[PDB]
Amino acid sequence: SSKTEQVTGATGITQSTVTAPLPEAVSSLSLAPTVNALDPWVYLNQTEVPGGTFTVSSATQPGSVLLELEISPELNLYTSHLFRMYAGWSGGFSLKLLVAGNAFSAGKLIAAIIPPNIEVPNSAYLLTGFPHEILDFRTADSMEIIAPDIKNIDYHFRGDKLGKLVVMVYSPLRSTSADFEIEIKLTSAPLPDFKFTMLVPPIQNNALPIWSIPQAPPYSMVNPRSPLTPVVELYINSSYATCNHQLGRYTIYQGAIGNSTFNPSGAWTATCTAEAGSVTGHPNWRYALLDLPDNPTFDPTLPPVPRGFCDWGSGVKSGNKQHLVCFTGKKVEGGFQDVDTHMWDYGDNETVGLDNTYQRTIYIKDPSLEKDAQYLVIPMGVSGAANDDTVQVAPNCYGSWDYAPTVAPPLGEQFVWFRSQLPASKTTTTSGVNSVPVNVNALMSPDLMCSAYASGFPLGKVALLDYVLFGGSVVRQFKLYPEGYMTANTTGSNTGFIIPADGYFRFNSWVSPSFMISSVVDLNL
Amino acid sequence: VTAPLPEAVSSLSLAPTVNALDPWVYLNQTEVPGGTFTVSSATQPGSVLLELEISPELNLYTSHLFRMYAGWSGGFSLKLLVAGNAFSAGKLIAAIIPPNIEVPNSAYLLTGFPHEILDFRTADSMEIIAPDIKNIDYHFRGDKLGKLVVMVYSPLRSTSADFEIEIKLTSAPLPDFKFTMLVPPIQNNALPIWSIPQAPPYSMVNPRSPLTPVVELYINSSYATCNHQLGRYTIYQGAIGNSTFNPSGAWTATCTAEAGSVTGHPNWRYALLDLPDNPTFDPTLPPVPRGFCDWGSGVKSGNKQHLVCFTGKKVEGGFQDVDTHMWDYGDNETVGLDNTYQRTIYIKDPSLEKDAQYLVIPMGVSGAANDDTVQVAPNCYGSWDYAPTVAPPLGEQFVWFRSQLPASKTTTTSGVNSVPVNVNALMSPDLMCSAYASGFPLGKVALLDYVLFGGSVVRQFKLYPEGYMTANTTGSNTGFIIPADGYFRFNSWVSPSFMISSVVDLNL
Amino acid sequence: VTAPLPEAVSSLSLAPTVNALDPWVYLNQTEVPGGTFTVSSATQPGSVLLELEISPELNLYTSHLFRMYAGWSGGFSLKLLVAGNAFSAGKLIAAIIPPNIEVPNSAYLLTGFPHEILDFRTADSMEIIAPDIKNIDYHFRGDKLGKLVVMVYSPLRSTSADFEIEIKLTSAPLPDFKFTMLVPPIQNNALPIWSIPQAPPYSMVNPRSPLTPVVELYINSSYATCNHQLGRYTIYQGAIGNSTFNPSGAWTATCTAEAGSVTGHPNWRYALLDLPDNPTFDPTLPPVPRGFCDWGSGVKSGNKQHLVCFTGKKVEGGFQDVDTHMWDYGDNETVGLDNTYQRTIYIKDPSLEKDAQYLVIPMGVSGAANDDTVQVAPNCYGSWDYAPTVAPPLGEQFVWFRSQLPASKTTTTSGVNSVPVNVNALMSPDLMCSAYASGFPLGKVALLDYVLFGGSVVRQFKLYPEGYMTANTTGSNTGFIIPADGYFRFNSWVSPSFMISSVVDLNL
DSSP, X not given: OOOEEEOTTSSOEEEEEEEOOOOOOOOOOTTOSOOBOOOGGGGGOOXXXXXBOEEEOTTOOTTOEEEEEEOSGGGSHHHHHHHTTBSEEEOOEEEEEEEOOOSSSEEEEEEEEEOTTOOOOSOHHHHTTSSEEEEETTTXXXXXXXXXXXXXXXXXXXXXXXXXXXXXXXXXXXXXXXTOOEEEEEEEEEOTTOEEOOBOOOOTTOOOSOOOOOOOOGGGOOOSSOTTSOOOEEEEOOSOOOOOSOSOOEETTTEEOSSOOSOOTTTOOEEEEOOOOOOSSOSXXXXXXXXXXXXXXXXXXXXXXXXXXXXXXXOSGGGTTSEEEEEEOBEETTEESOOEEEEEOOSOSSSSOOSSOOOSOEEESOSSOOSSOEEEEOEEEEXXXXXXXXXXXXXXXXXXXXXXXXXXOOTTEEEOEEEEEEOOOOOOOSSOOOOOOEEEEEOOOHHHHHHHHHHOOOTTOEEEEEEEESSSOOXXXXXXXXXXXXXXXXXXXXXXXXXXXOEEEEEEEEEOSSOOOSSOEEEOO | OBOSXXXXXXXXXXXXXXXXXXXXXGOSOEEEEEEEEEEOTTOOTTXXXXXXXXXXXXXXXXXXXXGGXXXXXXXXXXXXXXXXXXXXXXXXXXXXXXXXXXXXXXXHHHTTSSEEEEETTSOSSOEEEEOOOOSSSSBOTTOOOOEEEEEEEEEEEESSSOOOEEEEEEEEEOTTOEEEOOOOSOSSSOOSOOOOOOOOGGGSOOTTOTTSOEEEEEEOSSOOOBOOSTTOOOSSOSOOTTOOSOTTGGGOEEEEOOSOOOSSOTTEEEEEEOOSSOOOOOTTSOSSOSSOOOOOOSOOSSSOOEEEEEEOBOOTTSOOOOEEEEEEOOOGGGGTOOOBTTSOEEEEOTTOOSSXXXXXXXXXXXXXXXXXTTTSOOBOOSSSOOOOOBOOOSSOOEEEEEEEEOOEEOSSSSSOOOBOEEEEESOOXXXXXXXXXXXXXTTOEXXXXXXXXXXXXXXXXXXXXXXXXXXXXXXXXXXXEEESOOOEEEEEEEOTTOOOSOOOOTTO | OOOSSOOOOOOOSSOSSOBOOOTTSTTOOEEEEEEEEEEOTTSOTTOEEEEEEOSGGGSHHHHHHHTTBSOEEOEEEEEEEEEOOTTOOOEEEEEEEOTTOOOOSOHHHHTTSSEEEEETTOOSOXXXXXXXXXXXXXXXXXXXXXXXXXXXXXXXXXXXXXXXXXXXXXXXXXXXXXXXXXXOSOOSSOOSSOOOOOOOGGGSOOTTSTTSOBOEEEEOGGGGOBOOOSSOBOSSSOBOTTOOSOTTTSOOOEEEEOOOSOOSTTOOXXXXXXXXXXXXXXXXXXXXXXXXXXXXXOSSOSSSOEEEEEEXXXXXXXXXXXXXXXXXXXXXXXXXXXXXOSSOEEESOTTOOSSOOEEOEEEEEESSOOTHHHHSOOOOOSSSOOOOOBOOOTTEXXXXXXXXXXXXXXXXXXXXXXXXXXXXXXXXXXXXXXXXXXXXXXXXXXXOEEEEETTEEEEOOEEOTTSOEEEEEESOOSOEEEESSOEEEOOOEEOTTOOOSSOEEOOO
């Protein structure tokens, strides 16, 4: 059906259509042990879909996929909430597009329905082979699509493959103004034939339509990489700072990926079996070896380092020019007789010819080191190193090791880093070492991620959330990926930008990984 | 709905078997392969925007089914999708032309055929019937068919900012369409979809320098024409002058000629290039070996830029000397002719016997301008089957496969010093070997990405059946660079006049 | 009877639009893609000769149609054609296996399934009905289906003369066969027919001697095993080892001198090859530049055979002085290690500096070779994904490319000379770009007709998905030559263990 209206002033019209490019199959539910009805008011409540919205500009090419949504109870808030109580479901959905159009100049949209186990093409030409509808920007207000439930079974259990709706640009947008854009918004509600089947206790790990984040300012989150210095600032660096293998790597697949843990307090202490021998070059250095509790010394599959023991990094050409710092002490009955400051390398002096690695082979400036003795390691900071670049060195998984992979931000976006400051251990000694002030940056801390590790994440959607700080009102929108990096869209120069650390994170909506943020952080300073 | 010509329905009574179609193939929103074109203020009246034969190639599904069949009968229903605007004016004309009648090249004459005038203001959902005109019961392959022709009747004008109008065409067969005589699907009727394997340009060969890998693509506004012979291919072969599918083996040749020299230098010995086949030097086959470099232009001797190569005296298939030597391509100066392929080569070495055979391996130039000079290849005679000079359509620029040619040095004055340069190619045979089985529908061109790294940047160019790619994009700055880290992806078939909505700004 | 399991009527109630077939597809019987195999007295008891699914890929017209649809439901009627004679004694069994049931290795147990026994002397065609066994309303891709299994019920005690029986399968869809929702015809599925752009083998690239063209195909006693990893290309994983699709620009690597700790028995200068894919330093990625020479010179001494290469000193703009030198290859029995992994190389040139990034371009071999030296490549040592060592089945023998390597001479300034040698590669790579476009069925290899003289087919080869070709032979010679002026066409799938009917007599 169709319906046309005259706009105010009579300078155009707007259309509102209902279409069924129909598979159109209804199940009798003969094998369902019980058929569970719904509140009649759920069928009359059209809610925004997680995955919408998207914007169309003059630079948007045809053939690029703008939406890809599975037909399931997750399209509506109340069916998503209700579904946690049930075992199966059956029925189609009503999908409504809302086009903020005008008699701009021109352009067309195409929406198509795709059956399960069929690849989605990247051509507007091929989408016309599917059941579809076409729409014009000069007259489009709302298109309602009767999306069917395509299945070869009478009702669903969790884990099936489902049909999809795909939206694409059919003809490019045009207008006199270069800033004119068209925003598409999608809402959904179940069709009257929708039903649930079997009542079961709700799931505690339910992937819910709304994620609630308790008030916890960033400065309270501390710290996978420097767990002795409070977080006080948020950072935005624009030096192509793609994160190599670091600590604090958390994803909602595993918990902690790599040699990371949910208890990083201090700077995790480890010990070494300090055998030694001949050393060329430096005369004061001894080549010790690192022990591995909970990990066998002779298995490449597990990491050859204690869990939580990671960067401060090393391995640069100046690896022997720049030395790390540790509280070192010899092991004796009941504890450690003394705890002193010594220069440690944790690098690639002679034996490996490696880069920033994760041995299993650590070098020290101590000449007093003896073979038959265990020693303590509590890293503190740096000594003689540069700033802001030699802490974020680039290690990775070498050999047959399987660590966290290297990640980069998407084009047009940059990371945001939790930042802390390290004071300098300045000392006047006949024996002892100095230090240098340093800035330390870390990825998402487990205090905020652990909530996501429990609440859940819709599949294929990235969380969009705000950052509300001291009065007056100022909110910055970031995107929290399941892979565990929070990013922001930026414009301007490549300035290193500092953001406060007093504000609560607030969930806003579920968005696709490719979603342009309107709230940009103009890097001008 | 408009029917300029009535559709006469044929009862397939002489057909040995009548094969019915799936009833759902009569859904009329499938695009017409090649039924896409744009109009702008620059398009001249009388210009032909679309010329489609009325066959099963007008529909995505009948084009697929037709590979299984030997015969066909029926017509099509077309629909126009015009992305117009409120400020534009103009008209088009669509006409039906019978099978054995020529298409006129005037809109004045096109009005003599059954036709419809379409106004840009009221043509967004017009339906046209494309009939099947024949004097037989059904069609075989190789027939002569009627055509649909679309032309600009009144040019596009605007009362405000200039706007282009992109027009698309969708089709479905009429209820009287039928097929005949199942046959195995290895027939003609090139497929409506081309599946390109993902092979980045860096993994392809440069036929004009098959030892330096392709490093990047670039576009130059000055290079308005290409006249090369090496590295040129085609799908509607035919053939191309001296271009192989094995460019690496193409770059070795032998020469021999008796005593002689050039006027001003008794250091430039003559040498006639040997043929992979054998003489006579018939003026119907290439005079130079099937594999040979075009690294030369209209240079004249005397303080002249020259060519560098390796040479070696053949020894009973055994051991031969090899050293970098100089080489100029023909005595074009002494004949009043521009540099051409039929001239005998010269090598700057007095130590060469006259009855011996000498090897040649081109590797660079010396004392010469960079790419700008080797980009222009020598001339031809018009006496043998070679490749013509090709230019892009008005408002389109070439896309080339580019490689870097390093230099060679000598501490002594025994070898020769050579300078670096970037060698440039028009096409590679690795991108083509998959297009031969699929085919190209009726003089249409393919639109391709180029899904650059990350999937964020997507470029669009047009691959013609003549073996070159083009895209006009505003700007000077002759050198624009595109990474070779990417893969190709098929989008659609378009008419040659179709313009690309994506523009690669040449000023960034 | 021919139907021990009846076909179930599927009321396609849950199916959206139900799509019908041309009623003449139910009446044509076509060969089954991949339904071909052989039997002999050597066939091992209890083995499974054929294992097919009951998908639409069982018929030539349903597979082409299935590319246009999303689901299906039906059943097929099958026929076995046995090419035996009157001296053949034995019996076949063909059975239908429901999904989620394991196939037993005993013909005595197959009798519990719906089955059909068949004598080898039968000249007619035996019919079977293969129904679609489902608990669902219709099928999508990626399901679990029923199977047809063929086995030897009674062994062949027939061989008065050793004799192979060829068995072929033929199918047609039953009525009650239907398709479901119509979709554009583009799928990730091997085409039942493969069309090869006919190109003579001489117009192809030799990935182990790219500069010189191919001259012939040949068979030798070196067939016994293939270990090199430069002309290796698979159909499911693409290039493997250090193979490339452009071995005409993946050559010419650069080495960095170090001066090492040398023996050379005074002086042999060491060096290290540069690996641009830096993450390569680990044992998980290759230790050598992609597409670099893997010729052999081993094993014992390394003071009698040496490789040959051009070499130069890298400077500002490649202005490197180039001259012919020797070059050994890594670990030789006095530095104290096996032949070589890949990386470390030597050179017979004391002029190498400590860090000056020298070039290398392998040109030939010198010393005792004895081509048989070049056929065996260095060993593979580490944990990176090196190409395995492959061998042909009994009775079958490899077919290789082959090209000529001419020599070069010196006077005294380098002292190094090369020798005429022959270079062969596991056939590649221009023969595979078509296969990726078309694809290969699962578990099947391609049977070939190599056409040589005026269309008179003379030779037949098998092409495996692992990337090699074999032939059936008898005569045990080492110098069989096959011309490269012909072409080949497959369009035919057979099983492994399929004995080719055409035999190559390796005698005069």
